[PDB]
Design a protein around this ligand. Structure first.
Ligand code: GTP
Ligand code: GTP
Ligand code: GTP
Ligand code: GTP
Ligand code: GTP
Lengths: 285, 285, 285, 285, 285
């Protein structure tokens, strides 16, 4: 029957199915008087509002109340008439060792919710769990997988690397660095200029032209990440597919790099689960 | 059919419809011999005179006989020939959790009154309830909502803050501080000068030139409110729309602030329900 | 030395000391030819007759010539041989902010009077001022103050509520409703039956059987007061002590209520200053 | 010279010095007519009454007018003859990052107050700030710190965990769960039974026998907290010291647990600052 | 001038100089609110806390942020008044091919740090790099180096073997086996007994008597390591010096072996850099 794919992401939860899209992993459970003015869900004795509050930073999100965001994203991907669906969840690569913990709350059960009053329940056909970032592989045709590839997801705080040969994997790694670190570095001196910004509001300010982050600072970040990744891979080799939002930060200068074969694929942020959807096709079809 | 908007306000009830305007939330039910000389309404076994008496200070006005002022304002907004009307009531933000209590007396019923002898009854088409101060949002065009905004209502005893991103809310808060507190502070030493004034008569005395409240005291109040609001928002960010009467107190020096983008919108006191009227247009139209 | 307690009440002045009792707060200063036939006092350039005239309704009785009734009650509580006495006056709860005004005429002075010719003067040992209705607390033993309590004085036009935990207060409030309002409601249709009664003569007529106020109307008043008081207190909780004359109106059906723990204490009308006398014992002894 | 310790707590402020004790963090600043009947303090342009009003729930109490309760507790711990004192304040663990904000109002200054009229001022010798819950450590002798320990404070809405090896810390964490949540869960169905209770009055009702919360519900809460805490610690390991009021809720069944080494220490609620006092001894002595 | 020796070890960093000692290689860079309660260093844009967090297991520690622990150990070995020092670093034997990478960050430069606020900088006189485990050689006198020797370091996950003839080396090898593997084997069935232990906490539990690892299991590990090492060396020949912490695990039964000449030297864990210090004496003196 019908299938959906869900990416829990590093800062944004995201979904594809009969309904497709994304939203921030942002969450709150604090004081309230105007519930109607916020996206909200109450279930399992927990009340939450979605897309606002605190973003959190603790490792292994699977252990700190991910459930509300997960079910909210499921409701988004689904329509009110959905009977039952298959599940292809995704986790940050180095974290899938926690899948069993997820299996505690997830494996082949049925779930109830309210989410503003739509408030129905649904069972899941089956369960698969995959690495975040990696799935990009299956969105690719043989157009470039005819040669060796490197899926490279520039996640908010991380870079997720998996180098693959014919049909198969060759190596994997994670580096704890990301555009959030760049925002922190920028604020280390921009806040010092009599301001009260944060790593969360910053991007909107670069968008509106209120702030003038220098062009060469993005280049500094690019060089830093390249230096970090050198010991494992040759970027010139292993044609690299950039994915994630940070690739959307840096496309304009990634394109300027002297590398041999590479690209920032369209919807690079959602390319991983474009590939996960192709992998789902492979699984069922 | 036709619609009206009503703001219960902090010190003044106010209305817009086929008739528009405002008046103080002031009320009495005390001894009387010249009923004809006072605005008055008798209903539900309660006799009241409007715009005079005691202003009251208790929290949750919804529980201390708001009904007379509400129906009086309805009669003002309506004309004697009105058949039936839709309702868009407003409450102080942190107070809409009491809407259910309001729903006890209000939801889709018909109401009778006397009010000096016009003395007819009317049914209401439907019910919506909204936050006071917030509705300003919908009076704005994309002229400045293209960027992030902050509705900022300097209510008599409070400041009501709601920061909004595209089409949507980002955060909300209230601070229990207002021009009434400034009047109390001024009287803490001005009354001490062998006088018997109050926070109610004071503004008329500054108007007539009888009193000489220093210019820098308004600046002190501005700095106090700015210090109070800092922990949640950056004023330079989130282009701020000042609303409420206190904005009318301080316009002349608000305009002098070093902030980047901001304004005290025309009819700032009634701008919130200018926006509520735009929101009503959005609802029905 | 010896002490007295005085309750100014809502309709009746009242006293306890070497002489104890009560009488209406009724007063006149109008035309006269048979002074000997009326209780009377002339002092401070004011001539008054006690227990007859006009009852008055204005708020803050402390500002409209309470003095004659006060001194008359003092004379009642005292004997002609009294040298000097301590004072424990009482005010309606929300009104003790006017104590300073009372201190203008009262604090530690000596007073002269005539009152039909007894006509002596007396000084007062000291001054304390307490809330009317509340003092009931100290008449109670630990017999029921071992648990949480609620002093509930059903005064002529009001209900005075104070909820107390161990030895201490928890909350307080007033509601402007009373048996006078019930009498007004009854006369709203009973006078309409070609009669000229008032809220003052009515109770005598129910006493003599001339009038047949329905039983269920007292129940309607009970339900109205219960609905009014709900937002602040749980009647089932906070064992309630009914006090005041209206409790004497309603005892027969108060006893029928489904509440858990409660009572209409003996001399409920004077129970408050039974407790004030116990509090005086606590003060001096 | 002399030193004092103050715990701001989650629901109760508390103090030890020449005077020792505790009281609720409850506070009000609302309407008043009988100031003498309430604990009260007026300073810095703010009037407050202590131990009554609203308990508040917002995070980072350091930003919402904690000052009145703090100074009130200082006055309690001190005597009218106190010259100057050292300060060892405490904050909820995850919150001490706000100490700088506290340093804005506190570091080595002198403070004035009224508090019913005692109304003097005092300077502070020095400043230290410590984690709430943790300080229990220093009340322990080597009697059980010879082995690894776990300070475990079951605070009103939280559980505060710090696991310590020889003389030192090993790990720390907070879980947003507490007896307040249990009271909310109990009221989720007990209020539904035609009652108007809250999480605040409930404990008094279990105390008086009016309510019959089932024994197994406390066990359910115990199991829930144990499940929550498992991912970080082994309870059988790291001999656990239960602290806080909730430990006083659950002692009777905590003692029944199958764990190896543990205890609910005497005055578990105040054991943390018993240890903070021992730590003060260590600091100065 | 003065010299220091540093062992990066397998689980513990360690140092000798004007200050001597050791500590775990344990490290974290995660969320924080009580910096003062943890050993910490912030430099080169990286914030870390020492002796707690994650121990890590990846090969070639030189590539995964060893810098914080290294500089922390330098600060330990040095005093606040140190001007400049010589450097004799050590690496796991098979890893010194990475010395050039170390030379990228280390060779004859000056370094800055904060480490809780001491926060000074220092230059290094010169650079030497040596094998971990081997240096034990130079702590020995001719007391037993008159004959052939075998330095044998039973490191946490490894055994490091170097067989030496007169003044010189004869052969070298590493075996990937260690007491960490023994702890993993023990937990393979001890955790299975309804417990949540790890290879890190285990040794403390054997220390406190909570756990009863059988005596013969240490013998099994001894036999396994002996079988592993046989193909290269004769233990009876090449008088063996046991070094490292695991030798401290097994001394009591190592002494029982039927071998001809051998010993577990005092401070076997630090004997290697006792010898490295002797080698430094040889170098400069
Ligand atoms: N320009 C632009 N950037 C975006 C947009 N949405 C997200 N981003 C960027 O995404 C970056 C966050 O890091 P990511 O690369 O997305 O990390 P991640 O692992 O993919 O985590 P997720 O965003 O949840 O998928 C930030 O720098 C954002 O600016 C967008 O709509 N436009
Ligand atoms: N100058 C001037 N000030 C006004 C007028 N009407 C009201 N105000 C001011 O309004 C202030 C009261 O505080 P507000 O900002 O109005 O508080 P609010 O929440 O908006 O409550 P409402 O007045 O009922 O809408 C007082 O300081 C008044 O002086 C006016 O016609 N002229
Ligand atoms: N049955 C009866 N009722 C009385 C008597 N004296 C006073 N009352 C009642 O007292 C009621 C007046 O309201 P109260 O409850 O006394 O109000 P209050 O605040 O106590 O004012 P005071 O009467 O002055 O103490 C009236 O309904 C009277 O009928 C009495 O002797 N017998
Ligand atoms: N039985 C009993 N319980 C108490 C008493 N005082 C407080 N409590 C309990 O304390 C609990 C509140 O949670 P706490 O564990 O105290 O949370 P906290 O972090 O310590 O906050 P504080 O109470 O201010 O110290 C409630 O369940 C109360 O019932 C008491 O005197 N007797
Ligand atoms: N009994 C005891 N054992 C210790 C002590 N310190 C470390 N150890 C042991 O050291 C062992 C770790 O393996 P090692 O032999 O030290 O491996 P390594 O290559 O020397 O790595 P380092 O410990 O960092 O020097 C563990 O089994 C620990 O129990 C100690 O103070 N007492």
């Amino acid at each position: 029957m019908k299938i959906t794919v869900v990416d829990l992401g590093n800062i944004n939860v995201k979904y594809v199915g009969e309904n497709k899209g994304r939203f921030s992993s942002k969450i709150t459970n604090d004081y309230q008087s105007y519930e109607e003015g916020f996206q909200r869900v109450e279930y399992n004795g927990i009340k939450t509002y979605i897309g606002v509050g605190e973003l959190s930073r603790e490792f292994n999100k699977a252990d700190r109340d991910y459930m509300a965001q997960l079910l909210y994203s499921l409701a988004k991907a689904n329509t009110a008439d959905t009977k039952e669906i298959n599940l292809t969840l995704l986790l940050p690569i180095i974290q899938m060792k926690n899948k069993t913990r997820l299996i505690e709350t997830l494996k082949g059960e049925n779930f109830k919710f309210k989410f503003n009053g739509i408030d129905r329940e649904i069972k899941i056909n089956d369960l698969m769990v995959l690495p975040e970032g990696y799935a990009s592989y299956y969105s690719l045709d043989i157009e470039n997988k005819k040669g060796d590839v490197c899926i490279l997801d520039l996640g908010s705080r991380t870079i997720n690397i998996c180098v693959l040969e014919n049909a198969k994997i060759v190596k994997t790694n994670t580096i704890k660095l990301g555009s959030f670190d760049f925002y922190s570095k920028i604020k280390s001196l921009e806040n010092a200029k009599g301001e009260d910004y944060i790593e969360e509001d910053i991007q909107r300010l670069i968008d509106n032209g209120l702030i003038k982050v220098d062009s060469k600072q993005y280049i500094e970040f690019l060089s830093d990440i390249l230096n970090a990744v050198k010991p494992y891979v040759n970027l010139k080799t292993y044609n690299t597919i950039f994915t994630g939002g940070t690739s959307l930060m840096l496309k304009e200068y990634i394109e300027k790099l002297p590398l041999n074969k590479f690209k920032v694929h369209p919807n690079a942020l959602t390319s991983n689960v474009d590939g996960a959807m192709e992998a789902s096709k492979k699984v069922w079809n």
